[PDB]
Each structure stands twice: as structure tokens, then as C-alpha cells.
Amino acid sequence: ARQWQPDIEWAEQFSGAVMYPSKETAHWKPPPWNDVDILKEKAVTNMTLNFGPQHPAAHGVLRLVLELSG
Amino acid sequence: MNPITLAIIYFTIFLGPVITMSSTNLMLMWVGLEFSLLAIIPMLINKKNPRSTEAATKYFVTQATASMIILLAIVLNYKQLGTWMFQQQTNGLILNMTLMALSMKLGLAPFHFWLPEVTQGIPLHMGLILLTWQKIAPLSILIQIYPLLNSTIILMLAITSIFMGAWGGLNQTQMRKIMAYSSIAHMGWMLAILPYNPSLTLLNLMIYIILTAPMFMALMLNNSMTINSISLLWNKTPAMLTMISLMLLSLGGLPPLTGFLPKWIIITELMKNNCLIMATLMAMMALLNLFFYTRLIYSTSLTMFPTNNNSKMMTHQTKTKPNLMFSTLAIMSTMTLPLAPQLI
Amino acid sequence: KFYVREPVNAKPNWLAVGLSVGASVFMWIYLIQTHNEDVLEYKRRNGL
Amino acid sequence: MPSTFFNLTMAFSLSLLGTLMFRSHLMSTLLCLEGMVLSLFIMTSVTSLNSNSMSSMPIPITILVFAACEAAVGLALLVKVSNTYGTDYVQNLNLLQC
Amino acid sequence: LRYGLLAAILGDKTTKKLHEYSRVITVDGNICSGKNKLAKEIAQQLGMKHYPEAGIQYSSTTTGDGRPLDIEFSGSCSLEKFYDDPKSNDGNSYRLQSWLYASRLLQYADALEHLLSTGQGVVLERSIYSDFVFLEAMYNQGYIRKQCVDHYNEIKRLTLPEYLPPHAVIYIDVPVPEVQSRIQKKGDPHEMKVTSAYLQDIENAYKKTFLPKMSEMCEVLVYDSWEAEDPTKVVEDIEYLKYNKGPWLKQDDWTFHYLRMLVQDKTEVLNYTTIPVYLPEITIGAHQGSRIYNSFRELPGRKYAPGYNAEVGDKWIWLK
Amino acid sequence: LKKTTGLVGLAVCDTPHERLTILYTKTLDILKHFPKHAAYRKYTEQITNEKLDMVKAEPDVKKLEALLQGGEVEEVILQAEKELSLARKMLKWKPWEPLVEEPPANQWKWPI
Amino acid sequence: MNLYTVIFINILLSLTLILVAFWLPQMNLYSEKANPYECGFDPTSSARLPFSMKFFLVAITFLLFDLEIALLLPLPWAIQTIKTSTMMIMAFILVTILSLGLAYEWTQKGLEWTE
């Protein structure tokens, strides 16, 4: 009674990362709309340096545990 | 980027291929190739996102390896013949190595897996530049040594490229990957004819560029980077639909459009040289391209996919992006078959 | 008067229209001149 | 001369094999690219010197110049890669599979 | 000369234009907190431009004739219907929220364009940075769905990061009973149906997510209603604010240029609002979409490009 | 205009009289919300009214600083802001209320 | 032969000193003596963790400047040319390009260190 036009079910065929799917690729996901990917935060670890007590610049009895980047 | 950096990098990108084409010395041609690689890398890594860095690293590794093998070919030729240009008596293995490495640079299958990822991980304008301009410098060198190339190896690369690109384009649902695989297929076609008549290779390269550039401009018009995204064209920008359809069909190769002339003339020459088996296989397998283009046409122009409410607001705004070159190149790439004799 | 925001193409770019029309007429004039000159040269070289 | 050139050819071939066969670290691959460059430089310089073709000895120095430029670009890419994925392991460089 | 790299090179440098009062100030608060009252006076005193809060018809008003358009063209969403029936099965709730977020995005782009072009600060009643409070209230009530929330969050993730945050954030704090009484006093029959639970969720969002997050990147100035009265006090506080701790400090000419280029092309601003995620509330459908689009392009002055509609009054088309 | 303030980190104020009037008037406004019997209200209002009167009287910055006896006008401004913030905190606390509890019998006895 | 001889003698002398040092003194080896040193208190992590470099940009710029020194070094022989105009012009161009590159990296806060 009216020209059939594509519906949500029809349009979701062309939504997967690959269209003709496979067992290998079933775990793939569509790429993000903008190229940015929500990546797990990188926990930036900074070196820990004693800097004493036995240090020429530590006045003899300081354990100034330093957290350094570079 | 600031104006100075833009000017310098774009000048280097323009210079590279110019140096390669205008240089006689093979090493200066290699210098042109190196210029192109180094200058393109930053433009690729402009967006500074993980995908951009991934693609840039892949491109750099692959291209650097290929360029080193090319330089080996040049150096061994120097040892053999005391000169800096391949001569008629250069060793077949040296020439085959040059052929391999230029194939890997260009993206021909089997040396093709790198290309689709690089095209997927980068913006559309850089996709255009990479899939068009960066192919000029490598093809020039081969055109300069077409008498010497091995038809067996070149036809293996051509047939494999056609088959792999045609098969690959079917599955992909990403526009950039689709363009990459179309590039691989058309590259198989360009290389198939190089041993026999290089002018047809140039013809096909120009047809491919005139067909591809406007497609990338059309995609950029709305950043439509997926089949679903392009499906909303009928609402976001309706007028462009006719060109998108006709240009896709032309790239497929349906006769009445320009995109036929490359395949037709290439088959003509190949059969003139008695390459019937290869020509028939290539012509057969160059139809899956038409299939996975017809699917895009179905999705965009011949049906109306479900649309989005917010597009109502888009309808209110005004847009100014379609340049004059889109119109000119689209018409020139779809309605120029009648003038074919002048092109060949 | 109607648009809340003045349209970008509100008025003709008279420099643009003049350049376009002048270039068009120049191309036509040069083309006809070259056609006549080339016909004359062809006849001269081929002895009419 | 001929044995030396054969040995240099084998050196370049081994470096290229190492380049094409990855092993977790990107900086190592860059180093293999360097090794190939060095072998080529030596081959070119040896050829020029043995031919007494002094007009060709600028070419090797240009080889070095452009190889250094490429290495610099590679190291910058490494900087970006580490600033993202925390290290330089190439396994994490697989986002574009889909 | 439309702003481009050439214009930037030959001049049109933003840092040159930025002055003392080239800032972005955004009022915030629960409904009927006096936001417009405070904002109009702030703008008039500090010499800045006032931006009325974005509504359903903001785009219709800003483009073309400027008269409000039929709801079919303007979003097919109704605040009146939202209040009369929150848990409607026609997706009115989330359609309203998404349309309003997109409108706020457009208004923010316009205000940023003005600020970067002429260096005149802008006063905004609410911002895309604060729009999520209403969505959180809706979800906390049984109005909208987790998938609608996911769609909204994804669109915000895609759009918000591109732009710069407001320079100063003013939150006019009014308690739930007080706002309820003010709503009763205003006496809009649909508005009166609002629930104190909904208002309380709005306040909880505003004080648990918004102000905490904003404090990292902008100067915050919390007030009560009695402080909000008398704009001169708020204006004075803003006048003597010392500005630091923000992304605005790392900008330069060639960052403002690219931000301005992004903002200047409105379609590029709204690009990600139309992502093809098929949410049943927002999926219009081909036939209705075509009907609406054809009618819109049949509306007077919307058939052709701005400067090209002759029925409207445009002239000299044959040389344009 | 002052070249600098001796104290490091304190920026010279271009509009000291207006800033001081703003701060003192605001604090006067805050103190109204306190109970009238609030000793804080009474004393702080006395102090603020005195300072505001001197601010209005003397226009010269140097002589106004001499009058205010706070040192640099920038420091005076800083102290005014501190007073405003403390007034808000006291409003929250309600210190005017009676003693919360009595000490144990001999908590403050010494020598023990 | 002479350069080889002198360098080999140097190598042998250094190695002999190392061997004397490692095989003469009385050795008492235990774990505390053999563990790393950090100012009296045991280490809190390995010394092989990443150690961010705040001068990476100038490192790569040092590569480039080393190659430009490479381009410059032939000058003592070049100056003997008969095309002095071209030689001098090209050297001036090269040095000017070096200077302009340095100026750009300076003005873009490149020689400064990340924090």
C-alpha cells in the first residue's frame, strides 16, 4: 500500500565492523564515530629515589624520598 | 599548524614527486620518494589520536622498508654498470627487486595489507592526498623502465591485486577502507598494462584520480565515514546524490560512463598482445567492484534509510563547502566517454 | 530585510562578475583570432 | 672486491630479514633499518672508490643525510607511540584491524 | 572576507582583540532561580552581549526569517507534553533533551564565534556543560531509558571536548521548596505539574557533578537568592575575579584560528549530533522525514540559499 | 601608581578605594543575617563601619593607608576578603550559642 | 701497521690493568656488599623502569645538526675550487638555512624543556 523503505532492522545490517560476519571477527566492534578511542588510562608511574640519608647534600640524616619524572 | 609549517610541509609534499619525475639519476628519484614519505608523515599524524599514531607508524615502517630495498636495487645496478640509471643490460633480479619494492610502496597485493589500515586511520583530506598524489612518484619510475619489466611478475601482481581488492571491498562497511580497496583494484588495472603500453597506465591513473578526488570531497562534505552515515545524505544534502551514484557506477566501470574507457582500452591492448586468459579473468573479477558499489548506491540514492531527528536542525543551517572542482571533476569523470578518442 | 542575519551573498561581487565576463569575452576574442590565424597559416603552408 | 661485495650483500639481506621479522620492540626495527642503511652506504662508497669515480662520492653522503632524516621521523613517531600506549611494544599497535 | 587562513595571516588575530571583558560567563541554577534576571544585568553592566537561554526554537529564530517554526520542523518535541506526561511512549522526553542539547551546542558555537570575532564577552543562561543535569533527573525518575542516556553521553563525548569551557560559572542556589513555591507563583499550568523529586535530582546533579567538575577548569561563584538579588554585587565579584586554572590560558593565535574555523561552520558544529545510532525515540523514518523536509524546503525563504530566494526579496540573482 | 608591594605575591591594586568599599559593604550586608545580639555581628560591624568611614574620608592612597594602620592597601584588601569569608563561616557555625558542654571537674587545674 | 700496533698495545695495557685489579685484591663477597646503592636505604624499584627524557626534541635536532655538520665538513677541500662564487654562495645558503631552522625551533619554544 506504500513503497517499503528501509527500517531499523534493514539498516543495522550495515552497522557491524564487517558486514559478512565470521566467528573470528564476531568480537570486533564498530570504530568510534570520531577516530578517538576510549583507551584505558595509562597509570603514569614516577621513579622513587631515596636521596639520603648517606648523601653529600642531605645534611647527614634525611631520607628525602623523591618522586621524579626525568 | 601555523602558516610557515603548512607552507614548508606542503611544498615538500609537492616537491617530492616533482623531483622524482624530473630527475634522471635514480638516486635523485629515490630522494624524491624519501621527501614524499617524510613530509606526508606529519600531515597524517596531525590529529594526534591513537589511531593516527598507529597509522603513521605503519606507513612509516612499510614505506621505509620499501625505500631501502629500492636503494639496494639502485646500488647494485651501480656496481654492475657504472651508472645511475637502469640500462637494457641490468640484471633481471635487480629490476625485479625494484618492481617488488615499488609495488609495496604503491600498495599492490600481496603487498597491500598495510594500505587499508592507513587509509582507515587518517582524516579524509589526507586520505585523498595519499590515495592520489602519493601514487604519482612510484608510478613514474616504473613508466621510465617499462621496457625492462618482467611481464610474469607484473601480471601476477595485477591479477592478485584485482582479486584481493574486489574480494576485500565486499566485506568492508567503512568508507575509507572501501576507497583503499578500490585503489588496490584500480592499481592492479594500471599495472597490468604497464609492460605493454604505458600511456594507458597514465590514462587509467588520471581517470582514477578524477574519479576519486570528487568522491573524497563528497565524503568530506558531511564527514560521512560509514555506510550508515552516507545513507543520511538524502536528508543532509540531497542534490549530491546523483553524482555520488554516477561516480560510483563509473568507478565500477559500467560502459556509458567514463570509467569504462580505462578497462575497455586496457583489455583491447592486452588482447592485442595475446593476454586473453589474464584479460578474461580480470574482466570477470572486476564486477564484484560493481557489486559493492551498487550496494552503496542502494543505501544512499535508490532508497531512504532511517533518518535522525537532529538532522532537522542541520536543515536550518547554511553550508558553503561544495567547491567548483567537485562539479567540474564529477561531470568530467562521468560524462566524457563520447570524447574518448582524444583521451587515448 | 527578511533575513535576521545578512546573507553572505547579499549583493553581487562586482569585481567577480566583471572579471568573469571580461575573461569570457577575452577568451572568445582570442579564440576567434587564433582560428582565423591558423586557417591562414594552414592555407599558406599547404598552398591553399 | 667481489668477496667483500658479496659479504656486504649478505649483511644487507640479513638486516632486511630482521626488519621484516618483528620481535616486540619498534626501536629494534628502527635499528635494523639503520643496519640496512649502513650496509648500503658501505657498498656505495666501496664501488665509488674502486671505480675512482670521484664524481659519484657526493651520493653516499646524501644517502646518510636522508637516512638520518628518516630515523629522526621514526624516533618522533616512537615518542608519540610511547606517550600513548605507555610503551613501544608493537602488539598494542592493532587498533585499525576493524 | 570569510575567515580563513588568508584572513588570519593578513590580520583578524583574536589575541589582539581579547580585552579585559572578552570572557564567557555562564549562569546556572534550578528552574526559576532568577537566571535571566541576573544575566541581563551582568551583561548590561559589564558591556557584554546577553544570550537568552537556548530553547526548542533557537535555531529557527537564528536562521532565516527568525520566527518560530512549526514543531514538526523545530524538533517535534514539547516541554508542555513533557510535563503533562513524562513517561510517554512517543519518546518525547529524550527527543526534547537531545534537541535542547543540540540547540545549546549551536548557541555556544555562536557565542564563541562572537567572542573570538569581536572580543566582546558573552553571558549565557545555561551551557552544554550544564545541560546534563536535566537528563540525570529524567533518568533518576522513570522517564527516559539507559540507552537514551548512552546516546546522550556519546554525543556529548563527541562534541563537548572540541570547545573551550566557560571563563566563569555562576550558580544561583535556591532550595527545592523555594523553587516549588516560585513555580506555583508563576502559575504555568503545565509547569506546575513538575515534581519535587525531579527538582531535587536537578539540584543533586548541579551540586554533585557540575560545580565539582567546573571548579577544576573555571572560576566558580556560588550564590544564594538574596545574594543574586542586586546584580551589582555579582558584577563586582566578576570584575575582580583573577582568571587562572583553565584551558583558556594555553591558547594562541593559531589555536584560536582553528577553533574559530570549527565554530564558524555551523554544520561542522552539529556534525556529530546526527550520528547514525538508531535509537527508536530519535529515528524519524523515511516517509515522515521526506514529508517534513519537503515541507520545510517549501517554507518561504527556505527553498534556496540565503541570498537567493526571490519570493523573499533577494535581488540580482542573475549575477550572484 | 605603586611600582610594587614589598610582599611577594601581592599584586598592586589599581582601584583600591572601590575594592575596599565593595568588600566592606558586602561584609556589612552579610552581618545583617546574624542575630542582633551576636557579639560577632556587633563588633565586626563597628570595625567595618570605622574602616569604611576612613575609606570614604581619605582619597589619597598613602594617607588612607596611614589611617587604616594595616600597612599596604593591598594587605588591607586581603584582610577585608578574609573577614568576609570568616563572616560566612561564622554564619554557618552559629558560635553565639551557649557553651556546648562543661569541662570535667578539674580539667584546667594546674599545678595538679 | 703502526696505528694497529699502538692501539693494540693500548688495549692490552688496559686489559692487563683490569685483570690485575680483578685478580690481585682479596675478595670477600656477600649479598649486602653486592646489592645496589641508594644512600643507605634499599631500592624501592628497578633502575630499568622508563626514565622520561625532557630533551627529546633537541636530541632529534642534534641528529639533524650533526648531519648538517656533515654537509659542512668538506669545506676545507671545497675552498680550493675554481668556482668560488658558487662555493661561497652555497655555503652561505647552507649556514643560513641552519640558522633559520634553529631560529624557528627557538621561537616555537623547542629548545625549552617539557615539564
Swiss-Prot record, chain C:
Residue spans crossing the bilayer: 13-32
Gene Ontology CC annotations of this record: mitochondrial inner membrane; mitochondrion; respiratory chain complex I
Q: Where located?
A: Mitochondrion inner membrane
In which broad location class does this protein mainly occur, judging by the first location in its UniProt entry? Answer: mitochondrion
- According to the UniProt record, which cysteines are disulfide-bonded? none
Q: Does the keyword Nucleus apply?
A: no
Membrane protein topology class: Single-pass membrane protein
Q: Name one GO biological process term.
A: proton motive force-driven mitochondrial ATP synthesis
Identify the keywords attached in UniProt to this record, alphabetized.
Electron transport, Membrane, Mitochondrion, Mitochondrion inner membrane, Respiratory chain, Transit peptide, Transmembrane, Transmembrane helix, Transport
The organism's place on the tree of life at top rank: Eukaryota
Sequence similarity: Belongs to the complex I NDUFC1 subunit family.
The UniProt subunit note reads as follows: Complex I is composed of 45 different subunits.
Q: What does this protein do?
A: Accessory subunit of the mitochondrial membrane respiratory chain NADH dehydrogenase (Complex I), that is believed not to be involved in catalysis. Complex I functions in the transfer of electrons from NADH to the respiratory chain. The immediate electron acceptor for the enzyme is believed to be ubiquinone.
Q: What is this protein called?
A: NADH dehydrogenase [ubiquinone] 1 subunit C1, mitochondrial
> What organism is listed for this UniProt entry?
Mus musculus (Mouse)
Identify the gene encoding this protein. Ndufc1
- Measured against the full-length protein, the chain present covers 28 to 75 of 76
Curated annotation (Swiss-Prot), chain D:
A GO molecular function annotation here is: NADH dehydrogenase (ubiquinone) activity
Record-linked Gene3D superfamilies: 1.10.287.3510
Q: How does it sit in the membrane?
A: Multi-pass membrane protein
Source organism of this protein record: Mus musculus (Mouse)
Q: Which GO terms describe its cellular component?
A: mitochondrial inner membrane; mitochondrion; respiratory chain complex I
Family recorded in the similarity comment: Belongs to the complex I subunit 4L family.
Q: Which GO terms describe its biological process?
A: aerobic respiration; ATP synthesis coupled electron transport; proton motive force-driven mitochondrial ATP synthesis
User: Protein name, please?
Assistant: NADH-ubiquinone oxidoreductase chain 4L
What is the protein's major site of localization? mitochondrion
Enzyme Commission numbers on file: 7.1.1.2
Instruction: Name its cellular compartments.
Output: Mitochondrion inner membrane
Q: List the Pfam families hit by this protein, alphabetically.
A: Oxidored_q2
Q: Where are the transmembrane segments?
A: 2-22, 26-46, 58-79
Q: Which InterPro entries match?
A: NADH_UbQ_OxRdtase_chain4L/K, NUOK/Mnh_C1-like
> How the protein assembles, per its UniProt entry?
Core subunit of respiratory chain NADH dehydrogenase (Complex I) which is composed of 45 different subunits.
Query: Which reaction(s) are listed as its catalytic activity?
Result: a ubiquinone + NADH + 5 H(+)(in) = a ubiquinol + NAD(+) + 4 H(+)(out)
EC category? translocase
Please describe what this protein does. Answer: Core subunit of the mitochondrial membrane respiratory chain NADH dehydrogenase (Complex I) which catalyzes electron transfer from NADH through the respiratory chain, using ubiquinone as an electron acceptor. Part of the enzyme membrane arm which is embedded in the lipid bilayer and involved in proton translocation.
Domain of life according to the entry: Eukaryota
Alphabetical UniProt keywords = Electron transport, Membrane, Mitochondrion, Mitochondrion inner membrane, NAD, Respiratory chain, Translocase, Transmembrane, Transmembrane helix, Transport, Ubiquinone
Swiss-Prot record, chain E:
Q: How is the cofactor bound, in the record's words?
A: Binds 1 FAD per subunit.
Which keywords, in A-to-Z order, does the entry hold? Acetylation, Electron transport, FAD, Flavoprotein, Mitochondrion, Phosphoprotein, Respiratory chain, Transit peptide, Transport
Cofactor annotation: FAD
Supply the Gene3D superfamilies for this chain. Answer: P-loop containing nucleotide triphosphate hydrolases (3.40.50.300)
Q: List the disulfide bonds.
A: none
Q: At which residues is N6-succinyllysine found?
A: 87, 250
Locate the coiled-coil region(s) and give their ranges.
none
PTM comment: Phosphorylation at Ser-215 by PINK1 is required for the binding and/or reduction of the complex I substrate ubiquinone.
- N6-acetyllysine carried by residues: 87
| Gene Ontology CC terms, in alphabetical order | mitochondrial inner membrane; mitochondrial matrix; mitochondrion; myelin sheath; respiratory chain complex I
**Where located?**
Mitochondrion matrix
- Tell me where on the tree of life, at the top rank, the source sits: Eukaryota
Q: What is the effect of changing residue 215 to A?
A: Leads to mitochondrial depolarization
Q: Which Pfam families match?
A: dNK
Positions where Phosphoserine occurs in the chain: 215
- A GO term (biological process) for this protein? aerobic respiration
What SUPFAM superfamilies does the annotation carry? P-loop containing nucleoside triphosphate hydrolases (SSF52540)
Question: Which GO molecular-function terms appear in the entry?
Answer: NADH dehydrogenase (ubiquinone) activity
What's this protein's family per the entry?
Belongs to the complex I NDUFA10 subunit family.
Assembly, in brief, is: Complex I is composed of 45 different subunits. This a component of the hydrophobic protein fraction.
Function (record text): Accessory subunit of the mitochondrial membrane respiratory chain NADH dehydrogenase (Complex I), that is believed not to be involved in catalysis. Complex I functions in the transfer of electrons from NADH to the respiratory chain. The immediate electron acceptor for the enzyme is believed to be ubiquinone.
> What is the protein name stated in its UniProt record?
NADH dehydrogenase [ubiquinone] 1 alpha subcomplex subunit 10, mitochondrial
Name its species: Mus musculus (Mouse)
Swiss-Prot record, chain F:
**UniProt-annotated location(s):** Mitochondrion inner membrane
Where N6-succinyllysine occurs along the chain?
Answer: 94
Q: Which Pfam families match?
A: ETC_C1_NDUFA5
Residues annotated as carrying Phosphoserine in the record are 85
Tell me how the protein is altered or processed after translation.
Answer: Acetylation of Lys-94 is observed in liver mitochondria from fasted mice but not from fed mice.
Q: How does it sit in the membrane?
A: Peripheral membrane protein
**N6-acetyllysine found at:** 26, 32, 42, 56, 94
Q: From which domain of life does this come?
A: Eukaryota
Q: Which GO terms describe its cellular component?
A: mitochondrial inner membrane; mitochondrion; respiratory chain complex I
Q: Which UniProt keywords apply?
A: Acetylation, Electron transport, Membrane, Mitochondrion, Mitochondrion inner membrane, Phosphoprotein, Respiratory chain, Transport
Give the GO biological process terms. aerobic respiration; proton motive force-driven mitochondrial ATP synthesis; respiratory electron transport chain
Explain what the UniProt record notes about the effect of disrupting the gene for this protein.
Answer: Lethality around embryonic day 9 (E9). Conditional knockout in the central nervous system does not lead to any visible phenotype until mice reach 10-11 months of age: then mice become lethargic, lose motor control and have difficulty maintaining balance. Defects cause loss of other complex I subunits and reduced NADH dehydrogenase activity.
Recorded family membership: Belongs to the complex I NDUFA5 subunit family.
- Quaternary structure note: Complex I is composed of 45 different subunits.
The name this protein goes by in its record: NADH dehydrogenase [ubiquinone] 1 alpha subcomplex subunit 5
Q: What is the lineage of its organism?
A: Eukaryota, Metazoa, Chordata, Craniata, Vertebrata
Q: Which gene encodes it?
A: Ndufa5
